[PDB]
Ligand binder design. Structure first.
Ligand SMILES: Nc1ncnc2c1ncn2[C@@H]1O[C@H](COP(=O)(O)OP(=O)(O)OP(O)(O)=S)[C@@H](O)[C@H]1O
Ligand SMILES: Nc1ncnc2c1ncn2[C@@H]1O[C@H](COP(=O)(O)OP(=O)(O)OP(O)(O)=S)[C@@H](O)[C@H]1O
Lengths: 367, 293, 74
């Protein structure tokens, strides 16, 4: 009765002090606290904190730090996941809808997805592969992340490490500063609603160092499967649990990745396509896209011999960006010729009609 | 006590005079957020930041950061465009009165406009081209930029690369840092009022790259032909759409461009003029200008 | 001056509800510094925080550094 009557007096004085807020402030933040999570030390630290913002209303810069720290602390997911997959026959069907070929990456995903069923007595969910995909520029390394996320029914988020020179892009700044915010990883874990997404780190061989810091030293702490159980940035004081996260990183060469990161990654090399692989990719992915995006759908059509003519005589490369630029050129000039004088039915571009659209061939074929 | 008395007089008769007060700033910002654009995640972000701002101390070392951030969010463009499909003969007549010859670039622009006429009213993806123009040092590579922009009635902006070694020119800073502000691309999209300008990136093959300082790797995100739906600099913490903007870049050799950056761009050779072309250019463009001046 | 009076009376009530919460920030130190071990200079430098008392419920920017200092020291 004594603690309750004193808390009644607190409620009364705050009632004349509050204006529906200062009053509905906690039932905001404690439905936020008691609904999600949480680990016990983090909850006790947050509750030994939450009392101590009796400081606004003639103030404060003290309350606008603490309440936003509690806002960041109650919207990052604590132990809330998505259901695991039950067919490895459905994952294969979804992976074959988006890309042609690429048997090594697809089989490696199916292997590490079939290991995760058979293990009860758990050593495996602590170790998802830190996977790195290495290859020449036109091959589908970046567009393969979203398909892997869709086939396992998991959430996706891409982080681009292109020219990052700054620590506190990985970690944060401590909340004693003015505009302190957490890093990219806590922000990505907030955007994704769950604790087990797929995260793509786009060019990891391209990070820059600096005199003040080096983000590779911070990226070691994230991709280490002995430290990311207790990952801690500078904004959130509490340790945070990664390693439910499935990381995929992509790269052009291995020679400029730092040495403490190469030894903790499994490397899959992607070599570049042959001409039959490029002809299949062209026919069932690249030509319908370029026909749709130019308006000429149902009015023009290319044959297989013409696709071989384009591949052999107008491009040489490992990937497929130049091939889709040539096919888009055929679509643009088809639109131009239609808009001059229309025809009916569909015009069929045969292999002796390619220099009408593309010009003089660039490479002479071997014979 | 006297300076406290001054404090309370000034706060009273200033910010509670009634008429000449800050009715307009926060509430006009409130109504401005829900008019221009914007995507729903960005709008939720902006409204939560505004509600965070409306409880801060009068001052302030932290309210300036939030108000500057909301100003940058509200005056960058979201879904506003000067119009597409035009008359094609009128644009070829405008293109022919600024430059002699150069048939490949003119045909690329005209068949872009043909595609814009045929896809009018459909529900298909619209992606703007990304070109590089390669040639010897005197040919009209830079001069085609505002001519192509004036032909299609679009806004023009010119970023000069070359010598640039700082990565904080492409993206920005975190805005925890004190005088932070976004990169050149968001600033260029702010100067232009629309979401589809023509932006000239001039001498792209002269960016200076080493093991500390590499802005040519940050350009891989801005010129990616299907991942610049979501371009994130470090100042704005939202993904920004750079897929409608017509990029034209200029170079005079292809050897000092990195290979992943070269592979994202469509290359147009501009070879160098003959003697008959030089005589026509001198009769129609160079000698009347040098006579007038 | 009304709300100043109200903040100060509620802060009075708040530190009189801080018994064994804000009070008893010492007794882990009596548990672990009078054990086997610590020399007398460590007794001097370790009991440095008992009569620096009335500053953790008052503010502070340096309030919770006491549990940090003790949990790292003893
Ligand atoms: N097997 C494939 N089937 C279908 N499309 C493919 C295939 N391989 C590549 N592509 C397409 O190729 C395009 C370019 O692929 P990207 O992954 O974006 O290139 P990249 O792998 O990121 O390499 P970088 O970033 O230049 S080092 C995308 O539009 C993919 O859809
Ligand atoms: N075909 C042309 N017709 C008319 N004027 C031209 C033509 N080619 C070049 N010029 C003029 O030549 C001048 C120089 O052109 P610029 O575009 O500045 O050359 P540039 O290619 O930009 O040089 P750099 O070294 O590569 S930046 C301008 O005044 C142009 O108007």
């Amino acid at each position: 009765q004594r603690e309750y009557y004193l808390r009644e007096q607190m409620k009364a004085i705050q009632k004349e002090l509050g204006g529906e807020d200062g009053l509905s402030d906690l039932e905001a933040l404690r439905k936020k606290i008691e609904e999600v999570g949480m680990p016990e030390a983090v909850k006790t630290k947050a509750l030994k904190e939450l009392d101590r913002l009796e400081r606004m209303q003639q103030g404060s810069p003290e309350a606008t730090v603490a309440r936003t720290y509690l806002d960041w602390l109650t919207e990052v997911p604590w132990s809330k996941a998505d259901p695991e997959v039950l067919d490895i026959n459905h994952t294969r069907q979804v992976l074959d809808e988006d890309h042609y070929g690429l048997k090594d990456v697809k089989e490696r995903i199916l292997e590490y997805l079939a290991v995760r069923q058979l293990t009860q007595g758990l050593d495996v969910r602590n170790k998802a592969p830190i996977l790195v995909l290495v290859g020449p520029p036109g091959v589908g390394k970046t567009s393969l992340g979203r398909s892997i996320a869709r086939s396992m029914n998991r959430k996706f988020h891409r982080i681009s490490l292109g020219g990052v020179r700054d620590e506190a892009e990985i970690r944060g700044h401590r909340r004693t500063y003015i505009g302190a915010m957490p890093g990219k990883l806590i922000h990505a874990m907030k955007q994704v609603g769950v604790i087990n997404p797929v995260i793509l780190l786009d060019e990891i061989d391209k990070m820059s160092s600096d005199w003040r810091g080096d983000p590779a030293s911070a990226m070691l702490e994230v991709l280490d499967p002995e430290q990311n159980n207790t990952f801690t940035d500078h904004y959130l004081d509490v340790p945070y649990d990664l390693s439910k996260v499935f990381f995929i990183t992509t790269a052009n060469t291995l020679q400029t990745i730092p040495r403490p990161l190469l030894d903790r990654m499994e490397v899959i090399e992607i070599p570049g396509y042959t001409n039959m692989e490029k002809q299949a990719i062209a026919r069932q992915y690249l030509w319908p896209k370029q026909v749709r995006e130019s308006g000429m759908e149902g009015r023009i059509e290319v044959t297989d011999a013409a696709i071989l003519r384009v591949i052999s005589e107008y491009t040489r490369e490992a990937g497929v960006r130049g091939l889709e630029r040539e096919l888009g050129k055929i679509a643009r000039k088809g639109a131009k010729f239609w808009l001059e004088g229309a025809w009916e039915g569909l015009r069929t571009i045969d292999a002796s009609d390619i220099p009408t659209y593309l010009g003089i061939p660039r490479y002479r074929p071997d014979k």
